[PDB]
Amino acid sequence: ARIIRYFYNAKAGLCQTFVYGGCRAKRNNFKSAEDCMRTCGGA
Template sequence: MRGPSVDNIFCFIVSADCYELRDSGPCEALMPRFYWNQITKGCEVFNYGGCQGTRNNFKTMKVCLQKCHCKQPILIGECRARLISYGWNDETQKCELFFYRGCGGNTNRFFTKERCRAKCSQK
């Protein structure tokens, strides 16, 4: 019997980071960082003190979105295209089919259901 793949373990660890509360830590530096806000479903800036805190602490907006993209809502985007896509629904814990309109949207968008599951499923 084989254990879980490394990809699935990595995805679980990434998800745990995004669920932790924002914590500036006890130190007093003012380092701009980004954290995943579970209420607004987006990455937001905060001032990190420079020590301790939580793992929900990313150096750039890009890294925050890469790590927490499965937590974003499914957005169809603007424009008029109808591209078959899949997005992770964090409430149902499933990948859902939607038609991406070709511009706008966010990074919770995959071209195949398999890729969506591989990146976002915690199983």
């Protein structure tokens, strides 16, 4: 599928969107920018 999720971009220092297929997600995959920054924002 084409599911929009958020991931932490270490180089940019912030969370951005990417296309998640819908299955077998890795951990740098969040449903919101807030949850992404809370988990990966550092700090």
